[PDB]
Paper text:
The genome of Mtb encodes 13 mycobacterial membrane protein large (MmpL) transporters. These membrane proteins belong to a subfamily of the resistance-nodulation cell division (RND) superfamily of transporters and are critical for mycobacterial physiology and pathogenesis, with several of these transporters involved in the export of fatty acids and lipid components to the cell envelope. MmpL4 and MmpL5 share similar functions in siderophore export and are required for iron acquisition. Mycobacteria secrete mycobactin (Mbt) and carboxymycobactin (Cmb), siderophores with an extremely high affinity for Fe(III), via the MmpL4 and MmpL5 transporters to recruit this important metal that is essential for growth and survival. According to the protein sequence alignment with MmpL3, it is speculated that both MmpL4 and MmpL5 are proton motive force (PMF)-dependent transporters that function via a proton/substrate antiport mechanism.
Residue numbers in the entry: 22 to 494, 693 to 945
């Protein structure tokens, strides 16, 4: 009277294993490697409706210069002040850049014209910079290719002695970030596998069992990689560095956890005295639903990213869910098949300890005897991490999160050695009318607008037609001058319908004060256009500061939406499986409390020890994984409690603690260490995400699963399983 599903998985184990291996091999061989697919299918990091991107694109369209939103700055640095040779080299480089229309779309030559030459040259005179609008939006593969082409054009040429060109900028930073993440993914995988091997040898103390678990992990990881790369290659969805790295790490960790659960339950059945066939059937009956529910929870939590606004999270959503589904399918079908096939030979999967752990029994007895005090202590420990909130802050520049030898970092270092960050991050503001503004009164009004913008606090320079370098030059004889005509061509649209101001903020515009300055600039422009024929003009404001403001707004909204959706979906899944509202609520609440400790530990590790503030993407990525895995562990505990409750509530809790003590502890340690192994990446954002998830899962395994959940269960008693009667 064996159930049909485990019987089928056991009788046809060899065909199932062969089919899984063949499918995974086909997926990997037919389509290129995941790194190449991610490079080809990289997506822009800014939403198409972002105000900054729209403003920059509108400026490009109006002036008939470009249709992109990505600009890289080429900085010429010299050991001696630049002169005739440097100018000739710069002119040749500009001509070559303009020749390559495939990648370069516009070159804002300001050092060339004597009208704005002083603006583009450093105070010491040993350096200069030129902005280049390149094809493709920041982040996508076309932008990376354009950055590489610009860098090749600038560096690979005959340069004057002591003069070097560096291609810095936000687009270059994103390209180098993607390159570093893709490069470090291999090292992440290697270190993760080494850590997993060490942990498995420690847990099982058997080389054969470790090899079996490693084989299952390799199968699951390879399947997830193959399907993700296959779908990405055929343009089903976009991919990012974070998406690929998290797919790989989560696949490895989830496969290892599922294998640990199955093998631990099988070995517990063996220790109970059941034969190998009966042990396998007991293992399946006791862990198949738990593994399926845990995988569905992880997949749904990851899929919740798909309903965000920022392109990175949204593009990360679907691939993670698909990969988790593949890992679960492999674990529930190839898992038991491998276990049966292996256990049919010698003393392979038979346990070596053949003894119980008095520590877990003692912990269970203590938790049952004194639930209130243990619960209070666990809650206090979880909420201690809230102390990191007052000191918590984030930065948006990615220079800190990349290695110094990175070309973008070298360019930024040279620029900051010779220029200020405000100049390297100018803010563009276009005022567009439906008439021609090439009349002296309109120029007076434009100068008034520029003065209004300068009056705003933290506004260092306002370059425009009336202020080519920020210093004002108005008879028509001024118009008759050729330099004024060139300035009009540079700062006004070909038809004269629009005028663009370049605003350099005092200090650093990439701050909260910078956002306030942006808002005040919009207000000042609106005030200036009042009462003038410019009243109907539309105002667009783009740049690095506006882009980072949009990123901040999107990050906040995405964090809120992701947290809410993940909580609701996980609660629904746990309610469906456990058939108890109170149990699911307890699981979700305990993991939510663990989240605060996770955040506190991560902030303490990175801000106050390493010295690098958490990236603006770490928390939304880490929240879903922490919630899913903590819910899975509490689900294991609750499921075993439901199985053992027939002997009594407290006796059932103690038996659940004993049975699922070592297995879930080993699984949690393995998952936490696999996540923490991402810290080896050169990209520091991925390391922060991995360390945050690892710390959170360590706290959940040590405190939440062991103490908080059993204490809450004991205190609730019969009400823990409401509404179903016990």
């Amino acid at each position: 009277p064996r159930p049909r599903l485990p019987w089928f998985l056991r009788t046809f184990a060899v065909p199932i294993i062969l089919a899984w291996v063949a499918v995974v091999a086909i997926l990997n061989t037919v389509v290129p490697t995941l790194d190449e697919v991610g490079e080809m299918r990289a997506v822009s990091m800014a939403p198409n409706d972002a105000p900054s991107t729209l403003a920059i694109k509108r400026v490009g369209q109006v002036f008939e210069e470009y249709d992109t939103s990505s600009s890289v700055m080429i900085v010429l640095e010299g050991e001696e002040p630049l002169g005739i040779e440097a100018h000739a080299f710069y002119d040749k480089m500009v001509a070559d850049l303009r020749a390559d229309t495939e990648h370069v779309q516009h070159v804002q030559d300001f050092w060339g014209d004597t009208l704005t030459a002083s603006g583009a040259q450093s105070v010491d005179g040993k350096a200069a910079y030129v902005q280049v609008y390149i094809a493709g939006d920041q982040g996508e593969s076309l932008a990376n290719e354009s950055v590489e082409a610009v860098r090749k054009i600038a560096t690979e040429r005959e340069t004057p002695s002591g003069v070097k060109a560096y291609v810095t900028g936000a687009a270059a930073t994103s390209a180098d970030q993607r390159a570093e993440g893709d490069a470090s993914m291999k090292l992440i995988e290697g270190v993760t596998f080494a850590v997993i091997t060490v942990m498995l040898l420690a847990v099982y103390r058997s080389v054969i069992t470790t090899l079996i678990v490693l084989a299952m992990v390799v199968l699951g990881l390879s399947g997830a990689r193959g399907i993700v790369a296959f779908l990405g290659f055929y343009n089903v969805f976009g991919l990012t560095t974070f998406a690929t790295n998290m797919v790989v790490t989560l696949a490895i960790a989830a496969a290892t956890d599922y294998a640990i659960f199955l093998i631990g339950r099988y070995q517990e059945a063996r220790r109970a005295g059941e034969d190998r066939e009966s042990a396998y059937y007991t293992m399946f009956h006791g862990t198949a639903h738990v593994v399926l529910a845990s995988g569905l929870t992880i997949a749904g939590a990851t899929l919740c990213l798909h309903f965000t606004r920022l392109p990175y999270f949204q593009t990360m959503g679907v691939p993670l869910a698909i990969g988790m589904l593949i890992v679960v399918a492999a674990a529930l079908t190839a898992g038991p098949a491998v276990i049966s096939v292996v256990s049919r030979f010698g003393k392979t999967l038979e346990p070596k300890r053949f003894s119980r752990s008095p520590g877990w029994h003692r912990v269970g007895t203590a938790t049952v005897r004194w639930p209130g005090a243990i619960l209070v202590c666990a809650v206090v420990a979880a909420l201690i991490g809230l102390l990191a909130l007052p000191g918590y802050y984030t930065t948006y520049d990615d220079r800190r999160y990349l290695p110094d030898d990175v070309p973008a970092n070298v360019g930024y270092d040279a620029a900051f050695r010779h220029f200020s960050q405000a100049k390297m991050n100018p803010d563009l503001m276009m005022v567009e009318t439906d008439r021609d503004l090439r009349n002296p009164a309109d120029f007076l009004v434009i100068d008034k607008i520029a003065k209004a913008l300068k009056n705003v606090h933290g506004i260092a320079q306002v370059q425009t037609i009336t202020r080519p370098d920020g210093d004002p030059i108005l008879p028509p004889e001024a118009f008759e001058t050729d330099d004024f005509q060139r300035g009009m061509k540079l700062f006004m649209s070909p038809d004269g319908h629009a005028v663009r101001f370049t605003i350099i903020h005092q200090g650093d515009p990439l701050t909260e004060e910078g956002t306030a300055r942006m808002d005040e600039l919009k207000v000042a422009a609106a005030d200036a256009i009042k009462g003038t024929p410019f009243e109907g003009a539309r105002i667009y404001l783009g740049g690095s500061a506006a882009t980072y403001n949009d990123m901040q707004i999107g990050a906040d909204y995405d964090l809120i939406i992701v947290a809410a959706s993940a909580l609701i979906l996980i609660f629904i899944i746990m309610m469906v499986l456990t058939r108890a509202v109170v149990a699911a609520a307890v699981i979700v609440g305990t993991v939510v409390l663990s989240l605060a400790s996770a955040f506190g530990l991560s902030v303490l590790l990175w801000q106050h020890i390493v010295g690098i503030p958490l990236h603006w993407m770490v928390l939304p990525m880490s929240v879903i994984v922490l919630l899913a895995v903590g819910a899975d562990y509490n689900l294991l505990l609750v499921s075993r409690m439901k199985e053992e409750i027939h002997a009594g509530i407290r006796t059932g809790i103690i038996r659940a603690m004993v049975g699922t003590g070592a297995v879930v502890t080993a699984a949690g340690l393995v998952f936490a260490f696999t996540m923490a192994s991402m810290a080896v990446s050169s990209l520091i954002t991925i390391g922060q995400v991995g360390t945050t998830i690892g710390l959170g899962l360590l706290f959940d395994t040590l405190v939440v699963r062991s103490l908080m959940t059993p204490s809450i269960a004991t205190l609730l008693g019969r009400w823990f399983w409401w509404p179903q009667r016990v």
